[PDB]
Design an enzyme around this catalytic site. Structure first.
Site, PDB file in Angstrom:
ATOM      1  N   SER A  10       5.686  -3.375   0.795  1.00  0.00           N
ATOM      2  CA  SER A  10       4.186  -3.844   0.049  1.00  0.00           C
ATOM      3  C   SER A  10       3.617  -4.701   0.859  1.00  0.00           C
ATOM      4  CB  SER A  10       4.834  -4.421  -1.346  1.00  0.00           C
ATOM      5  OG  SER A  10       3.568  -4.537  -2.095  1.00  0.00           O
ATOM      6  N   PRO A  11       2.313  -4.809   0.954  1.00  0.00           N
ATOM      7  CA  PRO A  11       1.490  -5.768   1.672  1.00  0.00           C
ATOM      8  C   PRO A  11       1.700  -7.064   1.608  1.00  0.00           C
ATOM      9  CG  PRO A  11       0.156  -4.713   0.274  1.00  0.00           C
ATOM     10  CD  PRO A  11       1.464  -3.840   0.161  1.00  0.00           C
ATOM     11  N   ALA A  41      -3.124  -7.434   3.542  1.00  0.00           N
ATOM     12  CA  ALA A  41      -4.344  -7.756   3.452  1.00  0.00           C
ATOM     13  C   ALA A  41      -5.273  -8.160   4.694  1.00  0.00           C
ATOM     14  CB  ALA A  41      -4.653  -9.093   2.432  1.00  0.00           C
ATOM     15  N   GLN A  77      -3.894  -2.685   4.412  1.00  0.00           N
ATOM     16  CA  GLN A  77      -4.682  -3.043   3.358  1.00  0.00           C
ATOM     17  C   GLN A  77      -5.947  -3.886   3.647  1.00  0.00           C
ATOM     18  OE1 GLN A  77      -3.540  -6.327   0.609  1.00  0.00           O
ATOM     19  NE2 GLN A  77      -3.036  -4.785  -1.032  1.00  0.00           N
ATOM     20  N   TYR A  85      -9.178 -11.244  -6.447  1.00  0.00           N
ATOM     21  CA  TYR A  85      -9.964 -11.247  -5.091  1.00  0.00           C
ATOM     22  C   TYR A  85     -11.348 -10.342  -5.586  1.00  0.00           C
ATOM     23  CZ  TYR A  85      -5.532 -12.886  -3.181  1.00  0.00           C
ATOM     24  OH  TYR A  85      -4.623 -13.984  -3.158  1.00  0.00           O
ATOM     25  N   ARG A 142      -5.231  -0.516  -4.897  1.00  0.00           N
ATOM     26  CA  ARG A 142      -4.214  -1.571  -5.677  1.00  0.00           C
ATOM     27  C   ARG A 142      -5.222  -2.213  -6.617  1.00  0.00           C
ATOM     28  NH1 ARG A 142       0.356  -5.707  -3.871  1.00  0.00           N
ATOM     29  NH2 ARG A 142       1.361  -3.792  -3.636  1.00  0.00           N
ATOM     30  N   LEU A 184       9.500  -7.172  -8.666  1.00  0.00           N
ATOM     31  CA  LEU A 184      10.890  -7.463  -8.618  1.00  0.00           C
ATOM     32  C   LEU A 184      11.701  -6.172  -8.708  1.00  0.00           C
ATOM     33  CD1 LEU A 184      10.240 -10.328 -11.400  1.00  0.00           C
ATOM     34  CD2 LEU A 184      11.202 -10.690  -9.157  1.00  0.00           C
ATOM     35  N   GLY A 202       8.564  -5.824  -2.023  1.00  0.00           N
ATOM     36  CA  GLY A 202       7.804  -7.002  -1.134  1.00  0.00           C
ATOM     37  C   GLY A 202       9.029  -7.872  -0.784  1.00  0.00           C
ATOM     38  N   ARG A 203       9.377  -8.796  -1.446  1.00  0.00           N
ATOM     39  CA  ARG A 203      10.319  -9.757  -0.944  1.00  0.00           C
ATOM     40  C   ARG A 203      11.716  -9.683  -1.090  1.00  0.00           C
ATOM     41  NH1 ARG A 203       8.529 -13.275  -6.623  1.00  0.00           N
ATOM     42  NH2 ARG A 203       8.133 -11.083  -7.102  1.00  0.00           N
TER      43      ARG A 203
HETATM   44  C1  LIG Z   1       4.134 -14.226   0.761  1.00  0.00           C
HETATM   45  C2  LIG Z   1       3.528 -13.130   0.103  1.00  0.00           C
HETATM   46  C3  LIG Z   1       2.375 -12.575   0.434  1.00  0.00           C
HETATM   47  C4  LIG Z   1       1.820 -11.345  -0.302  1.00  0.00           C
HETATM   48  N1  LIG Z   1       0.609 -10.931   0.287  1.00  0.00           N
HETATM   49  C5  LIG Z   1       0.018 -10.123  -0.313  1.00  0.00           C
HETATM   50  C6  LIG Z   1      -1.166  -9.053   0.158  1.00  0.00           C
HETATM   51  O1  LIG Z   1      -1.649  -9.517   1.150  1.00  0.00           O
HETATM   52  N2  LIG Z   1      -1.707  -8.206  -0.488  1.00  0.00           N
HETATM   53  C7  LIG Z   1      -1.167  -7.749  -1.814  1.00  0.00           C
HETATM   54  O2  LIG Z   1      -1.682  -6.863  -2.394  1.00  0.00           O
HETATM   55  N3  LIG Z   1      -0.109  -8.474  -2.235  1.00  0.00           N
HETATM   56  C8  LIG Z   1       0.572  -9.573  -1.651  1.00  0.00           C
HETATM   57  N4  LIG Z   1       1.574  -9.865  -2.185  1.00  0.00           N
HETATM   58  C9  LIG Z   1       2.127  -9.320  -3.410  1.00  0.00           C
HETATM   59  C10 LIG Z   1       3.454  -8.331  -2.852  1.00  0.00           C
HETATM   60  O3  LIG Z   1       2.859  -7.299  -2.250  1.00  0.00           O
HETATM   61  C11 LIG Z   1       4.044  -7.911  -4.309  1.00  0.00           C
HETATM   62  O4  LIG Z   1       3.136  -7.253  -4.952  1.00  0.00           O
HETATM   63  C12 LIG Z   1       4.527  -8.807  -5.228  1.00  0.00           C
HETATM   64  O5  LIG Z   1       5.380  -9.740  -4.458  1.00  0.00           O
HETATM   65  C13 LIG Z   1       5.620  -8.155  -6.125  1.00  0.00           C
HETATM   66  O6  LIG Z   1       6.605  -7.444  -5.622  1.00  0.00           O
HETATM   67  P1  LIG Z   1       8.060  -8.077  -4.980  1.00  0.00           P
HETATM   68  O7  LIG Z   1       8.632  -8.549  -6.274  1.00  0.00           O
HETATM   69  O8  LIG Z   1       8.648  -6.633  -4.701  1.00  0.00           O
HETATM   70  O9  LIG Z   1       7.783  -9.185  -4.220  1.00  0.00           O
HETATM   71  C14 LIG Z   1       2.371 -11.006  -1.752  1.00  0.00           C
HETATM   72  C15 LIG Z   1       3.413 -11.389  -2.063  1.00  0.00           C
HETATM   73  C16 LIG Z   1       4.000 -12.419  -1.147  1.00  0.00           C
HETATM   74  C17 LIG Z   1       5.367 -13.309  -2.007  1.00  0.00           C
END
Ligand SMILES: Cc1cc2nc3c(=O)[nH]c(=O)nc-3n(C[C@H](O)[C@H](O)[C@H](O)COP(=O)(O)O)c2cc1C
Ligand SMILES: Cc1cc2nc3c(=O)[nH]c(=O)nc-3n(C[C@H](O)[C@H](O)[C@H](O)COP(=O)(O)O)c2cc1C
Lengths: 348, 348
Positions: free
Chosen positions: B21-22, B57, B99, B176, B224, B295, B317-318
């Site tokens: 994930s971005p 992003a 993205q 955004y 997205r 999550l 993501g995380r």
């Molecule tokens: C540090 C950080 C930066 C993120 N930057 C972006 C981003 O640039 N673009 C975006 O669509 N989502 C962004 N997210 C959201 C994640 O892409 C993801 O959708 C969200 O954290 C939920 O998934 P997870 O539980 O797997 O982290 C970001 C999240 C974190 C924690």
């Protein structure tokens, strides 16, 4: 949490007790140069949170390599690659260290994923006994050969220091050259360098002594040994204790207690922490600092062996191949707030 | 194991169903250039085994950035860095994607670890409503402003393709710019671009349409969206279904279903898989391919949502911040022999 308390060796402070165990990547150039593989591989684990990275077995001469793709340190040509590697480890937060090696009678094998077969190099050793069927018969070293290899270790150490490595490990384990001098299963010499225990330790202690003289005393010198060879009548824990006493007097800072590799046909009772008894005995009976290594995979396991006084440093090998950020996540499991890069704070 | 079966989008084959994930790293230069941080960060996760990396992003114009350290794609100056980043991801085994973003009324905030406070930039938006107290009042866009931003997206996409990215994601989520056009909590215009649902979708669909024309049909275009904004009277799942129908007709290959971020004062019922219902409904009721995210931390969880038909792709993501080799280890847990780099075979 002892696992995350600093450790002082010489005048170096490691910020925790976790170290990356040397692990050959078989991805150097054919002249033993650092490539892009190492420049990604190692910094990843420094960001992962280990206090100390030990770079893989680095050959002090060409015939000392384990494979044609091993790292080398026998030429000033190796210095630019090695200096960059040490820089990137350092900038990613870890102390950079390196293991100096000579493969001895196990030199010249193919990479593990290209068959692992011996290539029939002109290998050297203490006595004229092949490691196994298909391996060349080693040429026994004479005193001019021993002197030539000792200077290769000394010059390797000097070159490693100029590259910015702050910890030097001498590889005297796993049936490679110096390990094979220690064990009677591989050393059957009748001169000053075989027979007795004192003779078998004589050449390895000469190498250690000479490297210790070129590494300043504020920087740690480590030695890795096979604490037993698991063989009928072979090198045993008691011999390790004697060898460790000598290393201590001579100023070695830490003993990294591994085992095995001298010969092939032995029962090794693999289990979690199976080499911890050797580190524990050296540490408690000789008073030399030790590194524990061998199927250490868990934070609670690592902390427990430190709580017990079985070692000063925990080395991790395979767990860091499959899980490079293990140390960051291990902090949480032990109730320590991890220091993570700010970019990754939301993952913790 | 569906998790490790290939997925075909356009004429691209992703080798598994896991995607990174971005996630903004806030580590570009002040001109939005790629640095060493990204060149280590992203290739690490490609070696980790994801089929697809979505780069964070990337701002289509300077005032579209979230922070002064965001990546950019508004100048031919960005191309050398971006081309190298795409190369290294590709050489480490993953499909490189990116993205494209405009931060809209949330543009110009400090990095999270330097306070996260708004910097008082001249931000733009649909209507003159600050995101929150302390944030500048956005300047409502006119049709020449909308046209200027649409071409920034179009030129961004062209530049991303020239860099070698093979998947483009349009960021129409998280409050955004384009997200804020969709929601009535932030869009209160009375012209062609506010009031009704069809008006609120009008500008975002223009951007999607125009980007789709410059991205060849054999390469996937992803979008997205915030599937709900969680607010009284806001954007809801039903609106998402309508928006998704339009994206499908226009040739969008996949909808990446996130949620939230339009306004601050809302209850979000966080739990494992809490955005999976949105991906599931879009996939089953509209027949558009979906990405599940939110999550998702576990291999059995990821496989289960695919078995259920709730998504086509699982985004992480995380979990990849704290555990970059998750996909390699997840294979084992699902009874699939993992493809690992040969260097790491003994860790598995
Ligand atoms: C540090 C950080 C930066 C993120 N930057 C972006 C981003 O640039 N673009 C975006 O669509 N989502 C962004 N997210 C959201 C994640 O892409 C993801 O959708 C969200 O954290 C939920 O998934 P997870 O539980 O797997 O982290 C970001 C999240 C974190 C924690
Ligand atoms: C692929 C691979 C390469 C290794 N290379 C070396 C080496 O160059 N020098 C060395 O002393 N030990 C080497 N080892 C042994 C490890 O350093 C470590 O002592 C051993 O794997 C036990 O620890 P672990 O259970 O944490 O892996 C290697 C092990 C593996 C699996």
């Amino acid at each position: 949490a002892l696992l995350f308390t600093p450790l002082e060796l010489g005048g170096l402070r490691l910020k925790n007790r976790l170290a990356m165990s040397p692990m050959d990547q078989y991805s150097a150039t054919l002249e033993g140069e650092v490539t892009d593989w190492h420049l990604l591989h190692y910094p990843t684990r420094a960001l992962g949170g280990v206090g100390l990275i030990l770079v893989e077995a680095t050959a002090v001469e060409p015939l000392g390599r384990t494979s044609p793709y091993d790292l080398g340190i026998w030429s000033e040509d190796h210095l630019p690659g090695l200096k960059e590697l040490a820089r990137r480890i350092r900038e990613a937060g870890a102390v950079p260290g390196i293991q100096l090696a000579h493969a001895g009678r196990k030199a010249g094998t193919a990479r593990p994923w290209e068959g692992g077969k011996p290539l029939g190099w002109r290998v050297v050793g203490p006595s004229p006994i092949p490691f196994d069927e298909g391996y060349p018969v080693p040429e026994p070293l004479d005193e001019a050969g021993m002197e030539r290899i000792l200077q290769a270790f000394v010059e390797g150490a000097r070159r490693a220091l100029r590259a910015g490595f702050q910890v030097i490990e001498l590889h005297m384990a796993h049936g490679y050259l110096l390990s094979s001098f220690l064990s009677p299963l591989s050393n059957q010499r009748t001169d000053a360098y075989g027979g007795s225990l004192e003779n078998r330790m004589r050449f390895p202690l000469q190498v250690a002594q000479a490297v210790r003289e070129v590494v300043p005393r504020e920087l740690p010198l480590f030695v890795r040994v096979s604490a037993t060879d698991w063989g009928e009548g072979g090198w045993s824990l008691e011999d390790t204790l004697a060898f460790a006493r000598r290393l201590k007097e001579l100023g070695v800072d830490l003993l990294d207690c591994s085992s095995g590799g001298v010969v092939l046909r032995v029962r090794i009772p693999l289990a979690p922490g199976f080499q911890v008894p050797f580190a524990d005995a050296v540490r408690k009976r000789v008073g030399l600092r030790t590194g524990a290594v061998g199927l250490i995979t868990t934070p609670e396991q690592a902390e427990t062996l430190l709580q017990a006084g079985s070692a000063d440093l925990v080395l991790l090998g395979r767990v860091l191949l499959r899980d490079p950020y293990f140390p960051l996540r291990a902090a949480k499991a032990l109730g320590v707030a991890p220091e993570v890069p700010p970019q990754y704070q939301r993952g913790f």
